Amino acid sequence: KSVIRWCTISSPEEKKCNNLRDLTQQERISLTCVQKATYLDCIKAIANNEADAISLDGGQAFEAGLAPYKLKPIAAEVYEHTEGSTTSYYAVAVVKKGTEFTVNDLQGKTSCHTGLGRSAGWNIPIGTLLHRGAIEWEGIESGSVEQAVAKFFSASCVPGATIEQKLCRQCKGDPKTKCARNAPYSGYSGAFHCLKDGKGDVAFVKHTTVNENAPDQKDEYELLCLDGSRQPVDNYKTCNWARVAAHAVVARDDNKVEDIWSFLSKAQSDFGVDTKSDFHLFGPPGKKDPVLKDLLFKDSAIMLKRVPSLMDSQLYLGFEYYSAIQSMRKDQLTPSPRENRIQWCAVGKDEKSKCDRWSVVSNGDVECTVVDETKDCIIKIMKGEADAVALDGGLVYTAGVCGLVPVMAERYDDESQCSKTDERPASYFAVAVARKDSNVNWNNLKGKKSCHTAVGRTAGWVIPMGLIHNRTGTCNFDEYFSEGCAPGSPPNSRLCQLCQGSGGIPPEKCVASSHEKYFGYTGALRCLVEKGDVAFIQHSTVEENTGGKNKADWAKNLQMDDFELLCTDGRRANVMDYRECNLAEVPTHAVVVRPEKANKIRDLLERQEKRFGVNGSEKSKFMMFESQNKDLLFKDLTKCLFKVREGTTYKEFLGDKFYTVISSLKTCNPSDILQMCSFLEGK
Ligand SMILES: C[C@@H]1O[C@H](O)[C@@H](O)[C@H](O)[C@@H]1O
Ligand SMILES: [Fe+3]
Ligand SMILES: [Fe+3]
């Protein structure tokens, strides 16, 4: 058959691996073992098609993902928690009950660490100490990070250290191997016993370490909280140094992946936590020889959660931790450039081009990053490779789930209403549009041809299809009109039928970008005009494409009488009486960013609109809210942009009535990105 090759890192862990192997043979997918010297050798193997997997610490998933390895975290350990047990843990500083020093007197003491470059055992502590000024270190140019740590503590045990002598002084073992990544005083448990045997005044481990090593003697220990205090070991929640991503199984980004999951999945039930076999995949935990704890998988794991395919290590660790690990590899001083020009995310050719113009006009204050899929933006902002993008009400939801917050929102009422008080509401209306001679009524759509802006957007889909999903109570939307068009929709479906494409080289029909013709508010309007019976859209869409407000081969001659609105139920009405005949009133499009960037781009974007707003300084050179009826970067309807009060969550912005429609609706068939974020934002 096909045997998944698992890499190991110690004789003990090797035995472990094989024992499982024997038992995992008659399985569809089988297992095999490959011992190596260090976790780093195992990474190279897998990368060089010599191995197939291995579970790493967060600090090491970060390396596995770096080039030329670029491994992918396919599965994540799960831990016992009260909130709900997910894929994360806590870093604590454990000391002896009775000693008196506070985290503030750590200087001069001795310490015990799990392994160099590990999360709880070194990254959180050292970085936190470098952060607090306790340890002096400006960058790799002020000296090695070890040299500093060794000048802080008197002696320590850092399994993995090779530069500083003192960092191996407190280690127990053979003079030649007492400072290894598998040495006795290594890992969470080793680091604990190191502290136990007086070799250290502190141990940097995870919230469970003291429990899986000396349960009945917990009262003889305390935690060293950040605020200067000491607290009982069971108070890790109100006294830890951080929360990190659980260890993960990393592998090559290829067809195998899927299969391995099969091995680890079958491997779970048969040898899981509730297992009966004399064999355990996870621990079990508790007192025991440190040399036998955390083999292949930490004894504290209780499951393995499959990781959404869109996930890459950098996404996995989170922007803060990932930047921390960076901090200690590169010098600082430098930076400055970058952090003072918004990196706007453009989607499609038409947008980059408009953005390009904005980049030069802003003389540098704005640089652009083109992507093809509007969701690509979100992921680029999460990683920090991008700072901001204005999303439609429906996508703001996903951006929110992904951790991005709405900081600025467009207003459509009056270019002079973004600095309001009582006049607080900012919104627009969704409407169903049809022809004059047309014999289509909202209750005839049982088989008419329809036009949608893009799948997932407020007016062209969420709201419309929402009214169906709420009615029918069904999730299948493709089979409700004989045919229509809604970008981003199933290339081979009734709904892409009416769609026209790009027009040239590589098709591009039904794509969710300006590239596809019927894409967007006016695109749909077109489709109605030349191909369908109904168009779902904004309340001002009709007026924008009529009245010489557009000179496209079609709209060139359009009047807003050759169109009528479809009133929720019953009749039709003048395209002007939308406040009385609309599908719904919705949340205005918004600029979204990382919570920590809110201060900057909300300020730099104010300086910009000032220069290129509806009535701005240099509107002559460039205007942020104009696009040839194609709503590029911002919706043409935008009169100005208003600041969303600091601390506003996406849910509070989208409004409840609306928020409720996307949540459930989005449950019908979640997008790739939405599974990957939900995985991050806890479960
Ligand atoms: C052991 C190595 O495994 C790889 O996956 C295979 O493609 C090669 O045969 C090679 O021998
Ligand atoms: Fe760890
Ligand atoms: Fe919209």
- Domain range annotation of the chain: 2-88+245-336, 89-244, 337-427+587-682, 428-586
Residue 185 annotated as binding site: no
Residue 428 annotated as binding site: yes
Of 469, 628, 622, 475, residue with least CA distance to 552: 628
Alpha helices by DSSP H, listed for 507-597, are: 521-529, 541-545
Query: For residue 46, which phi and psi values (nearest 5 degrees)?
Result: -45, -45
Q: Report how this structure was experimentally obtained.
A: X-ray
Neighbours of ion ligand 3 (CB under 5 A): 392, 458
What's the CATH code, domain 89-244? 3.40.190.10
Tell me how far the alpha carbon of residue 49 lies from the centroid of ligand 1, in angstroms: 7
| Residue 230: both structure tokens together | 């000491």
Q: How far apart are CA 204 and CA 224, in angstroms?
A: 10
404: exposed, middle or buried (Cβ count in 10 Å: 0-12, 13-18, 19+): buried
Taking CA atoms, 266 is separated from 28, 31, 73, 290, 303, in Å, by 9, 11, 19, 28, 12
- Nearest ligand, CA 79: 2
Tell me how far the alpha carbon of residue 153 lies from the centroid of ligand 2, in angstroms: 22
Of 140, 174, 177, residue with least CA distance to 327: 140
For 636-654, b/e burial (b = at least 16 CB within 10 A) is bbbbbbbbbeeebebbebb
Beta strands 405-411 and 640-643 are antiparallel
Q: How far apart are CA 247 and CA 231, in angstroms?
A: 26
Q: In what order do the strands lie in the sheet with 72-79?
A: 55-56, 248-251, 72-79, 301-306
| Residue 205: both structure tokens together | 């481990």
Q: What is the CA radius of gyration of the chain?
A: 29
* Structural contact between residues 495 and 487, judged by C-beta atoms closer than 8 angstroms: no
With H, G, I as helix, E, B as strand and everything else as coil, classify residue 262: helix
Q: How far apart are CA 289 and CA 283, in angstroms?
A: 12
Q: How far apart are CA 591 and CA 400, in angstroms?
A: 11
Residue 398 annotated as binding site: no
Q: How far apart are CA 89 and CA 321, in angstroms?
A: 13
Of 516, 506, 569, 576, residue with least CA distance to 546: 576
* Structural contact between residues 202 and 78, judged by C-beta atoms closer than 8 angstroms: no
With H, G, I as helix, E, B as strand and everything else as coil, classify residue 413: coil
Q: How far apart are CA 22 and CA 203, in angstroms?
A: 37
Q: How far apart are CA 302 and CA 290, in angstroms?
A: 19
The domains spanning 337-427+587-682 and 428-586 adopt the same CATH topology: yes
Residue 650 annotated as binding site: no
The helix or strand, by DSSP H or E, that contains position 260, with its residue range, turns out to be helix 256-271
* Structural contact between residues 640 and 396, judged by C-beta atoms closer than 8 angstroms: no
Tell me how far the alpha carbon of residue 50 lies from the centroid of ligand 1, in angstroms: 7
| Residue 427: both structure tokens together | 């919104």
In the chain, the N- to C-terminal Cα span, in Å, equals 34
CATH superfamily of 428-586: Periplasmic binding protein-like II (3.40.190.10)
* Structural contact between residues 601 and 342, judged by C-beta atoms closer than 8 angstroms: yes
DSSP 588-629: PPEEEE-GGGHHHHHHHHHHHHHHHSTT-TTTTT--TT--SS
* Structural contact between residues 625 and 635, judged by C-beta atoms closer than 8 angstroms: yes
Of 462, 501, 474, residue with least CA distance to 658: 462
Q: How many CB atoms lie within 10 A of CB 15?
A: 15
Q: How far apart are CA 5 and CA 249, in angstroms?
A: 12
Taking CA atoms, 656 is separated from 272, 402, 544, 649, 651, in Å, by 41, 19, 29, 12, 7
Residue 631 annotated as binding site: no
Residue 589 annotated as binding site: yes
Of 131, 130, 112, 124, residue with least CA distance to 185: 112
Q: DSSP letter at 309? A: T
Beta strands 483-485 and 449-451 are parallel
32 CB-near residues (< 8 Å, 6+ apart): 3, 4, 5, 6, 21
* Structural contact between residues 342 and 365, judged by C-beta atoms closer than 8 angstroms: yes
Residue 120 annotated as binding site: yes
Of 367, 362, 538, residue with least CA distance to 463: 538
- Nearest ligand, CA 34: 1
Residue 69 annotated as binding site: no
Q: How far apart are CA 442 and CA 433, in angstroms?
A: 10
Residue 57 annotated as binding site: yes
Of 309, 321, 310, residue with least CA distance to 384: 321
Q: How many CB atoms lie within 10 A of CB 116?
A: 22
Tell me how far the alpha carbon of residue 229 lies from the centroid of ligand 2, in angstroms: 24
Q: How far apart are CA 426 and CA 454, in angstroms?
A: 22
Q: Fill in the amino acid letter for 498.
A: L
Q: How many CB atoms lie within 10 A of CB 40?
A: 17
| Residue 88: both structure tokens together | 């994360």
Of 481, 478, 475, residue with least CA distance to 489: 478
Q: What CATH fold (topology level) applies to the domain 2-88+245-336? A: D-Maltodextrin-Binding Protein; domain 2 (3.40.190)
Q: Dmax over Cα atoms in the chain, in whole Å? A: 93
Q: How far apart are CA 292 and CA 375, in angstroms?
A: 45
Share in percent of the chain as helix, strand, coil (round to 5): 35, 20, 50
Q: How far apart are CA 453 and CA 440, in angstroms?
A: 20
Of 295, 125, 304, 137, residue with least CA distance to 226: 125
| Residue 632: both structure tokens together | 């590029």
116 CB-near residues (< 8 Å, 6+ apart): 122, 146, 158, 159, 160, 161, 181
What architecture does CATH give domain 337-427+587-682? 3-Layer(aba) Sandwich (3.40)
Q: DSSP letter at 194? A: H
With H, G, I as helix, E, B as strand and everything else as coil, classify residue 44: helix
Q: How far apart are CA 620 and CA 600, in angstroms?
A: 26
Q: How far apart are CA 494 and CA 481, in angstroms?
A: 8
Beta strands 572-573 and 449-451 are unpaired
- Nearest ligand, CA 248: 2
- Count CA within 13 A, CB hemisphere, residue 255: 1
